[PDB]
Design a protein around this ligand. Structure first.
Ligand SMILES: CO[C@H]1O[C@H](CO)[C@@H](O)[C@H](O)[C@@H]1O
Ligand SMILES: [Ca+2]
Ligand SMILES: [Ca+2]
Length: 122
């Protein structure tokens, strides 16, 4: 699949669910990062667009307590790149995953209603 960055001003930022719906309407989904190669592809896309250090929704959403975090596209959550100490469900309200678009490419769980950039796959 092809990844596409949506780096938006405040007017066009989206919640996790809004971002998921946008990517699905176009024929894809929010991006799943299933290995280091995908991660490095997205990092290069971030550098090519000058989007260094921006935050982006990924397809990470909590499933059942048993499943834990899942990918919206249904791929297995095998590879992980959570930031140290994450996911921490800070204040019990963090059920969606965002990418910190710096060289670490780390993930953090945050409130699903936060307005963010996002990355689609198509
Ligand atoms: C204070 O809350 C923020 O910082 C902590 C630690 O980084 C994260 O876990 C959390 O999701 C928020 O981004
Ligand atoms: Ca993937
Ligand atoms: Ca967190």
């Amino acid at each position: 699949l092809c990844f596409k960055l949506y780096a938006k001003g405040k007017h066009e930022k989206k919640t996790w669910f809004e971002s998921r719906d946008f990517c699905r309407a176009l024929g894809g989904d929010l991006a799943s990062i299933n290995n280091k190669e995908e991660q490095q592809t997205i990092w290069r896309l971030i550098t090519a667009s000058g989007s260094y250090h921006k935050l982006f929704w990924l397809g990470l959403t909590y499933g059942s307590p048993s499943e834990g975090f899942t990918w919206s596209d249904g791929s297995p959550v095998s590879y992980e790149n959570w930031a140290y100490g994450e996911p921490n469900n800070y204040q019990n309200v963090e059920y969606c995953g965002e990418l910190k678009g710096d060289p670490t490419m780390s993930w953090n769980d945050i409130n699903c209603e936060h307005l963010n950039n996002w990355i689609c796959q198509i």
